[PDB]
Amino acid sequence: VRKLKHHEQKLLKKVDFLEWKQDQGHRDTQVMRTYHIQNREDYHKYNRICGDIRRLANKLSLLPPTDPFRRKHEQLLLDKLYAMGVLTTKSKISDLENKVTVSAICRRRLPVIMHRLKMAETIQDAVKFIEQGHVRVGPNLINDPAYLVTRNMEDYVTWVDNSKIKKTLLRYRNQIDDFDFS
Template sequence: MVRKLKYHEQKLLRRLELVSWEAAAGSLAEVKALRRYRMGRREDYVHYKALARAVRTLVRRLRDLGPASAAFRSRCAVTLLEKLYGLGLVSGRQSLAVCESLSAAAFCRRRLPCLLVKLRMAQNLRHAVTFVEQGHVRVGPEVVTDPAVLIPRAVEDFITWVDASRLRQKVLDYNQERDDYDLAA
């Protein structure tokens, strides 16, 4: 029903890479998640799905261990829960039932732009991704320009603006906290 593209049209389309629907045809839920979390690379989401699947299979294997290895099972369960809680993927350390429902969305929520929105440093994910890519955000002493960085709970408190950032200056002006030394600079 659609006409065949001419040579020059095919050449232009080769340069312009539109959404690769063959690659994204995995599922509609995947495309929705890519849009919802403003993820630039599909490979990141595929990697998160694989990690979540690995955690769920590990939890099932721990659950299926016999009663003879109860001490080993409890030790491994505590270690796994501590690790997942430290990464911020689960909300509590009570039981492995929480880990059985772990999804790729939990990994997406621990990305830096999502945490910027959660900490009210950005209005929405689109602005947060832009701030990160432009180099306005630092985590600890390091400036982060990759929005795919996963932030653990321990580092979440160290997310701040870069000292030379115009956004930081605007926030300080708005809160009337800008120092006289900063005004001279």
């Protein structure tokens, strides 16, 4: 706040207005600057989900390795976390503490898969396009960036028709049909 003098650095050292202990290195701020999250509290409503799956994976580790309730529920949880694409494979239950990340559950969001399959070219312009209302997953339009997708719907992320940026890329490649109205 004043870049304190030396008898100043020594007399009080733990003073830091910018970064406290309970900031955890501002990882919420850092990852929402990374994946461009609109409002606050999305980080912590993902972190509650991460804590809940590691807690119930802990108590599924607690139960003895022979009963079908335990084994059916851990394979069901692993298949559902594969089916929403949080994972990339159906591997070990140790990946339910090494590989589940608030980062990866942000990786399944709609603007970042848009930047991933090059529909946009940056995540900021992806949020621009989907607040302007151009894209859809299957039939229905998507307005909010908080809609994360599942493993089936990374194939039907497409724009709507009459979206004029779709029309500009069609007339770029001059494959612009207009019987189909776009």
